[model samples]
Target chain A: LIVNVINGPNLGRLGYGGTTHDELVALIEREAAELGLKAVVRQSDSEAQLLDWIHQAADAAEPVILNAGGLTHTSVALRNACAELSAPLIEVHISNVHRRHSYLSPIATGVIVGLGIQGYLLALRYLAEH
Target chain B: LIVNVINGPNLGRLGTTHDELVALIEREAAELGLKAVVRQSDSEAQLLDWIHQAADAAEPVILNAGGLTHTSVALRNACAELSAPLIEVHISNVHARSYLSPIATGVIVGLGIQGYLLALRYLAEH
Candidate 1:
């Protein structure tokens, strides 16, 4: 089964050259492979492009993981896009958005945070179980 | 001396509505002569109007903004509008409100559930 890791906005810059040892993409790929499912990571900085990707995924029968940065609390359009997805869409966050921010909800299966890059492990477990 | 007590969403339903909610408003009103102050309350669009009134109260005004205390962005801006001295109050130990944690910093004086009457009196004394 194909797992589409949909990253939004500045996420591709995650764990770049400085401040962190391992890159987020490398960790996700490692964990995804361990689960026996090949992971495909795609990223975009635009809301319209993110929605388009979701639309394509729905049309082509696939499960997905979405990390919507910045727009987590303010975008109902993103919420609507997730609502349109036929496959399971899990939301992942690097920061504990709930504890740090006011009013954050975006049609997530559940949220993972404060776990550092290890959060991908939690997501992998969720995908494996559900 | 005039004070404005503003209540927001799902709040007017307070007191008379909750057996356990503890009707603190009536006692607060009596303590502050709120009846004489017109007892104005608003929701949504009218909220700004209340803030505007507080701004225009050239007289040193006191504010006991309810749920709006740490929630509404517009209300916070309005409290700032009162370049005149302003005091804000609330009726619960917000830190103790179960999962209802608050992080905003506009709370000048908060007496928790019992603080309603105390806050009004505190402002009067100072």
Candidate 2:
């Protein structure tokens, strides 16, 4: 049971956040293992790269937890790619991800929001049961 | 008027003509027993003013925000504030899409100008 955790755009930046991407990866891996699922945590600053990763999951029928960052608003391209997913897509957003019109929800099986780092862990929990 | 029909950014060109489109909406609105106040604007503020009016008045809206559909958070947020239902209408679907889908009560698209009449009918029944 492998779930791909795809982070988009500026999600890799450790700037104002205290948590580094590496730390996030560790936490996700630990939680995924505890939940009996393997988390392939990936972060990219590129939309095309995110698409490539999403495509891999689609091809494999693996669950995905996507935090599409700013692409949630601007990229119909990202929405288009996610639409093809054969498995469940869980959308995760740290803050008021609820603030915008969600291009993801129509495609996503579920959305996890406002839970900080625990959002990822929680998504893995759902997928572990899924 | 319980229904506000708000159009944005070059949407006035519909029917290949604005007045013609208004006439159809008027006729359909008449059949549906709806008082639809149709407004079209290229300016975001003008459109926002209409949305604000709809939100505060508790009037359901049929919005065809044209290009602003993909770009304006102000418009989406304003629609979100609507106490009454908000239905987004697109004359063509571009095969279909949304900047308002998540907030919209529902969306009507790819149905040509019939989409506006359909939105009216949906609100008429709402």
Candidate 3:
């Protein structure tokens, strides 16, 4: 299966302990191949760009693992576009959203948060197995 | 001027009954010398229609979109049409929320039930 992993806003600044965006992409691509899946991972600092990516995913009926950053709480346009997706749309966050505000919770097939970068790998494995 | 106070989804389920919430808003509106039309719904389309009516009238709105606050892009889209001010309210403190509708003229969260009343006051004064 082909999956689109999209990151929004400050996600480009994902490295705190040592990990960087490019490293995660390489890691995700390698892990995805190991799981027999093709993973297209993307990140953006702009809401319009994020929306455009989501629109393409929606049009193709592709499963998406979206870490929409602040857009998760702010962009209705982003949400509106995601609403059109026919395939599974999994919302992801690196931190435990439940530890934050009620607004951080999401409306998606499922949510993965506070699990760190491993969350994406887990999502990939789930997609591959199921 | 008329103010549309629209609530979405679990808003009706907010601590008190829906009728009670409406009655409170109505009474408060009257006290403030403002006409308030309060509506709540579990259906997104219904909420959209209400927002559309408000937009057409160019009336200010007080919206508490419940779970849709974190979800419905369509709801946000509908709200973007409002020519008048749009105040986003939440009974709970969503200070921790990662996102909110950028179109809102202002936001009131974590203020409890009084948040709606406060929104009405703002609309009434301005």
The TM-score obtained by model 2 is: 0.51
In candidate 1, how many Å is residue B63 off?
A: 38
Give each model's whole-structure lDDT. 0.53, 0.75, 0.74
Model 3 clashing residue pairs (backbone): A73-B99, A73-B100, A74-B99, A74-B100, A80-B73, A95-A114, A96-A114, B93-B110
TM-score of chain A of 3: 0.90
Model 2 chain A: worst 10 consecutive residues (lDDT sum):
A93-102
Q: By lDDT, is 1 or 2 better? A: 2
Q: Which ten residues in a row have the lowest lDDT in candidate 3 chain B?
A: B92-101
- Using DockQ as the measure, name the better of candidate 2 and candidate 3: 2
Which candidate comes out best when scored by lDDT?
2
DockQ, computed on Cα atoms, for candidate 3: 0.02
lDDT of 2 by residue, B19-114 (tens): 888888887798889888888899999999988887889999888877898898898788889998877666553332346767876554444576
- For model 3, residues A27-63, the per-residue Cα lDDT tens digits are 8898899888889999999888988998898888888
lDDT of 3 at A28: 87
**In candidate 2, what fraction of native interface contacts survive?**
0.00
Span of ten consecutive residues with least summed lDDT in model 3 chain A:
A98-107
Candidate 1 vs. true structure, TM-score: 0.46
